[PDB]
Design a protein around this nucleic acid. Structure first.
Lengths: 47, 143, 141, 100, 77, 61, 56, 103, 145, 63
RNA sequence: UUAAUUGCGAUAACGAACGAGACCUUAACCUACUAAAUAGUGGUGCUAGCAUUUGCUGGUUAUCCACUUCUUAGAGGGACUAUCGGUUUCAAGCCGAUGGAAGUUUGAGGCAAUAACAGGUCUGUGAUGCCCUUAGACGUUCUGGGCCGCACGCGCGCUACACUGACGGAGCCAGCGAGUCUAACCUUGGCCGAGAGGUCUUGGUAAUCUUGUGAAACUCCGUCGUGCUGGGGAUAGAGCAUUGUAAUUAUUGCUCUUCAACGAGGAAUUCCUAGUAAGCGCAAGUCAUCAGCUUGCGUUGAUUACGUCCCUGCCCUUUGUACACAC
């Protein structure tokens, strides 16, 4: 299929959503699955 | 007992050295004299239109002996300033690269400093004896 | 060997390590002496530790202080504590007690921050506000 | 043979057990060395909104990674590249063996 | 009401008809400075600095203590 | 609000009724002695139980 | 080769991907937990479950 | 240079002179508000006294050629000696007569 | 420490380039009064004419003002690197020009009159008087018409 | 300006609806051992010195 | 009495539990222990200069030697309100003085009880019940517009309304964080150009290289002048570049010119008790490019309270209720 993209055609790794991405941190996922994942990123939660 | 620039004030030293180059020794002619802003954040050329260069040389020569290994790219952010970017808040803007490059190339053949490896320039002995002797005479000019 | 002691000072972001040794009695910071640290008003403020008992205590003692970090007034606030603490360390290393107790009581009875580090550190900023103890505009109806 | 052992682990109580252990193994025979350096803790800052949608207050959270890294340096001939490579590894602890 | 202003006329270039009176009217002044010259002698701030420097050249007044945009002065007493 | 709570109060009079002639009006050795009594987890709470125990011991005298 | 930061977040999301996947088809097999061990020349993954012989 | 006595003793004398002694308060009443006048503590006296000089010289040197260097200088001597022309003394008597009316 | 006599040559009113020029102020900033010349270009011409900078506009001779303003018509002949001119690489000529105080509004009228004949997006709204640079005017700029 | 010197020993409490007024017990230096109740704005405590414009008044409480 | 059913004490109650407290982290001190060229300090060597007469300022990883005080957290210690005098059945509890890092639970956060909203979300989910569509499909996708459009009214925000200033030259000091592998990020140094920007290389997968992020607010030298003016750049015109398949309703950056309202904003309203507000800047989120926003950090850093329920609200006790979907 004729397609160009190549300018930010990145979706969520775990849910394939082109909504707000955090990215530049090794996760490239959405905020909601980032919330309901737990114990993997920033789990310490001292603060 | 041996006087260096550190033992004397910064302002009177760079003024005495500026008058030294004003009167003795030819620094260079920039070509775009008193038609540039000496930076990008500014919009007015220096009021001391006939000068601003030999005192420019005095400041950079003092600092290149103050610091050890810095380049023109570093000199741009050293003498940068906040720019009134219209309605936007003030942001730091680096100085003009050509002005800092021109004065540095002006002073290479003078001998005030020599090219250093691994980046930057390192002070030569010919260019620091005079840079240090001027401090040994500038503190006695008051009396 | 060489008789030398070293102390250090603190500020909001300024640290002032001081090197004290017995010599011809010199004072300098960053290679520049005391009368050039460029507060241009607080010049007397940094003179304060070394003036209220005179120069008899600095006849043959070289002290050198290196300062890094902090604001301009914070930078100036760093040397006075370093030289005062270095003065105490020299009093604690080479000279007798009768001179030491008089020196310290003159320091403490006048000003606290000469030897007492300030523990008033900035408070972290809170969510929903520009500052630590500031809140956004509500603007309801 | 400049054997350098680098440790990277998150659980602060765990790599210290490893770091103390390798020092004990390196203390055997003579195997001159240096003590454990303490590098700054690289705290990671991930900031997300608690609410998924726009409803609610502007509530913010900061999830942090506290990774602690402490390497050691050893110098000895070829026996130690065989008598130290024995891995005292545990879950959550990563080791990086670099020579020379 | 906010009527039209007076358009203050502090001097910006000196001239003989007004250069002569400074040496005769400034005397008998206990406290002198740059500021009093602007609002009383109707002269510029920069003009006051050079004029006072010229007037102090004659060995009558001395800077004593001076700094940026400020000075203190006192007549011969 | 510098007010004591029952958490330090239940442990205090329990210490007194069983381990009285062990401690003294002293403070820091009271902290050290607390290690030699039934184990307590937090050292921050140890700062308060030692501070409380001497407080009753001033009153009893 | 890659940065350690990118390395310790890559195996994290690797562990998150595996932990999610085990619960998808081994939910009815008494899943408890999955631990990943990093070792040279070999990788160790252990699943905590109840019916060991049924999944064997 | 002018009034060659110690300036710090002059500003102290100015503080004593310009420090208001009594002031009025606020009373609810209901529907309309009324003011009752009682005395003022010396701690509030000095704290208000310094402020009156401060915001009395701010507008005097504001939008004018005169700088704030001598504006504070002329205000403090006027308050110390007593001139009834500066802002500090004018406000001091204004509250004195306000308290006198509602004494 | 310079003392200068101010004889009757001083005048309170100036008239250069067929426009009203005010005196009694610095000549460098007195040239900015005349439209079409800004603060930056003012000091370039003042120093190119080799005239004193702190002299007032009133105490000025004919030769100095003539030398100052003769630059404006043909500055390119007077060794300027030619990046300050307001009319550079014009569509009609392609050369670098500096429109004087009276050709500034004539030039943009010609610029506007050719935008109107072409009926471009940037020209129709300019005739309408609305925004052409893409700036938002839905909630800003209400009190201008 | 007829003024009288006033000496304070005891304090009653903070009064007023806003709470910016304090009930303070105050005595007199001249003709001592005489008790008169007076109000005050600024923070006060024992062993302070105060000056009153008038001496013959008595206000119980303020709003 | 305490911020706290937080404690004393009284008491048809006893025994209790959750929350708070407790707990954890961060910012604080350690010249006490292990310490450390991916941080340094001093000295010994090489080398440069100033007065040379005694010193000072420097540079140098294969020139080494000693140390961790300044830089980093590991085990740890350290203030619990500890003493006096006042107040209290003189019990809880409160106030003023001395070492200092700390006497508003050391400050600030995290977690944060039962029950409820018929508060928001089917536009996060390959989690969704029901209804609808299911093939010129409401499925996916391609081209071009739209979410930016103004007769207008409102809410968070930035420049302001100039002399504690504007402008240009000198001194010019921080912290948080991020950064490329089968990809192309941060970019140092040299050279060219006023500027943006362009070329050749160097160092780094990171306390090491960007980066001492040499930032700004700041002070020193000058010009200006009380003038809708040198404040202010809305408003437009032309030219120089970057991002990208494409940028026109200027993406954005740079240069010149045009130089309007705005001259301290009336009802009313917002935040605030110390490094706090406020002034100022930096890193990150959105990003191929674009901060006037937000999240974190840093610089300078006030006056005013140590009180009250009067307005706006909260908790406990008593009383009244023709309310109970509950003023």
């Amino acid at each position: 299929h004729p397609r160009r993209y190549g300018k930010g055609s990145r979706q969520c790794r775990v849910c394939s959503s082109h909504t707000g991405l955090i990215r530049k941190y090794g996760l490239n996922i959405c905020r909601q699955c980032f919330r309901e994942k737990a114990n993997d990123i920033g789990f310490n939660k001292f603060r | 007992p041996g006087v260096s620039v550190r033992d004397v004030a910064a302002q009177d030293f760079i003024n005495a050295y500026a008058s030294f180059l004003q009167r003795q020794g030819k620094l260079e002619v920039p070509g775009y004299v008193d038609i540039v802003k000496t930076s990008s954040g500014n919009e007015m050329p220096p009021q001391d239109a006939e000068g601003w260069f030999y005192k420019r040389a005095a400041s950079v020569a003092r600092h290149i002996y103050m610091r050890k290994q810095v380049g023109v790219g570093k000199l741009n952010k050293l003498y940068g300033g906040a720019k009134s970017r219209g309605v936007r808040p003030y942001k730091h803007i680096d100085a003009s690269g050509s002005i800092n490059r021109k004065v540095l190339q002006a002073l290479e053949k003078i001998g005030i400093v020599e090219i250093s490896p691994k980046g930057g320039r390192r002070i030569s002995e010919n260019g620091q004896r005079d840079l240090d002797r001027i401090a040994a005479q500038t503190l006695e000019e008051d009396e | 060997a060489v008789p030398s002691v070293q102390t250090f000072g603190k500020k909001k972001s300024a640290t002032a390590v001081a090197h004290v040794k017995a010599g011809k009695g010199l004072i300098k910071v960053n290679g520049s002496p005391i009368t050039l640290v460029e507060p241009e008003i607080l010049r007397f403020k940094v003179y304060e530790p070394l003036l209220l008992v005179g120069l008899d205590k600095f006849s043959n003692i070289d002290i050198r202080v290196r300062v890094t970090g902090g604001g301009h007034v914070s930078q100036v606030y760093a040397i006075r504590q370093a030289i005062a603490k270095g003065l105490v360390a020299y009093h604690q290393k080479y000279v007798d007690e009768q001179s030491k107790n008089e020196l310290k009581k003159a320091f403490t009875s006048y000003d606290r921050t000469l030897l007492i580090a300030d523990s008033r550190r900035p408070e972290p900023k809170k969510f929903g506000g520009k500052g630590a103890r500031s809140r956004f505009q509500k603007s309801y109806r | 043979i400049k054997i350098r052992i680098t440790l990277t682990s998150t659980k602060v109580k765990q790599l210290e057990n490893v770091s103390s252990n390798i020092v004990k193994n390196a203390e055997q025979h003579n195997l001159v060395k240096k003590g454990p350096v303490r590098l700054p803790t690289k705290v990671l800052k991930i900031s997300t909104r608690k609410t998924p949608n726009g409803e609610g207050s502007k509530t913010w959270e900061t999830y942090e990674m506290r990774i602690h890294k402490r390497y050691i340096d050893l110098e000895a001939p070829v026996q130690i590249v065989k008598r130290i490579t024995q891995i005292t590894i545990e879950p959550g602890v990563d080791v990086e063996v670099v020579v020379a | 009401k906010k009527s039209m202003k007076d358009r203050a006329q502090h001097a910006v270039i000196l001239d003989q008809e007004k250069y002569d009176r400074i040496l005769k009217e400034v005397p008998t002044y206990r406290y002198v400075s740059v500021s009093v010259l602007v609002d009383r002698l109707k002269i510029g701030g920069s003009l006051a600095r050079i004029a006072l420097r010229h007037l102090e050249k004659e060995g009558i007044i001395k800077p004593i203590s001076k700094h940026s945009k400020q000075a203190i002065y006192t007549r011969a007493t | 609000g510098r007010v004591r709570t029952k958490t330090v109060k239940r442990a205090s009079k329990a210490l007194i009724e069983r381990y009285y002639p062990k401690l003294t009006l002293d403070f820091q050795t009271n902290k050290r002695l607390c290690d030699e009594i039934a184990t307590i987890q937090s050292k921050r709470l140890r700062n308060k139980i030692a501070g409380y125990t001497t407080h009753l011991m001033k009153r009893i005298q | 080769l890659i940065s350690k930061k990118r390395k310790l977040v890559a195996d994290g999301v690797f562990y998150a991907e595996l932990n999610e996947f085990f619960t998808r088809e081994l939910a009815e097999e008494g899943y408890s937990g999955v631990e990943v061990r990093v070792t040279p020349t070999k990788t160790e993954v252990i699943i905590r479950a109840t019916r060991t012989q049924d999944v064997l | 240079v002018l009034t060659d006595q110690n300036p710090i003793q002059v500003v102290v004398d100015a503080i004593t002179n310009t420090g208001p002694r009594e002031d009025t308060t606020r009373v609810g009443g209901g529907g309309a508000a009324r003011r009752q006048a009682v005395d003022v503590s010396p701690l509030r006296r000095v704290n208000q006294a310094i402020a009156l000089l401060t915001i009395g010289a701010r507008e005097a040197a504001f939008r004018n050629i005169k700088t704030i260097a001598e504006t504070l200088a002329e205000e403090l001597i006027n308050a110390a000696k007593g001139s009834s022309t500066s802002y500090a003394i004018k406000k001091k008597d204004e509250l004195e007569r306000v308290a006198k009316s509602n004494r | 420490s310079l003392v200068v006599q101010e004889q009757g040559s001083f005048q309170h009113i100036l008239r250069l380039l067929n426009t009203n020029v005010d005196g009694n102020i610095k000549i460098v900033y007195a040239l900015t009064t005349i439209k079409g010349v800004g603060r930056r270009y003012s000091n370039l011409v003042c120093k190119k004419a080799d005239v004193d900078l702190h002299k007032r506009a009133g105490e000025l001779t004919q030769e100095e003002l003539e030398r100052i303003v003769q630059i404006m018509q043909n500055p390119t002949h007077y060794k300027i690197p030619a990046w300050f001119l307001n009319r550079q690489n014009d569509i009609t000529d392609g050369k670098d020009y500096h429109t004087l105080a009276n050709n500034v509004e004539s030039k943009l009228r010609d610029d506007l009159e050719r935008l109107k004949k072409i009926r471009a997006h940037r020209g129709i709204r300019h005739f309408w008087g609305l925004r052409v640079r893409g700036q938002h005017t839905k909630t800003t700029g209400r009190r201008r018409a | 300006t007829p003024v009288t010197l006033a000496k304070v020993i005891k304090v009653l409490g903070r009064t007023g609806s806003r709470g910016g007024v304090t009930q303070v017990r105050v005595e007199f230096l001249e003709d001592t051992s005489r008790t008169i109740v007076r109000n005050v704005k600024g923070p006060v405590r024992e062993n302070d010195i105060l000056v009153l414009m008038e001496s013959e008044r008595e206000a119980r409480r303020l709003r």
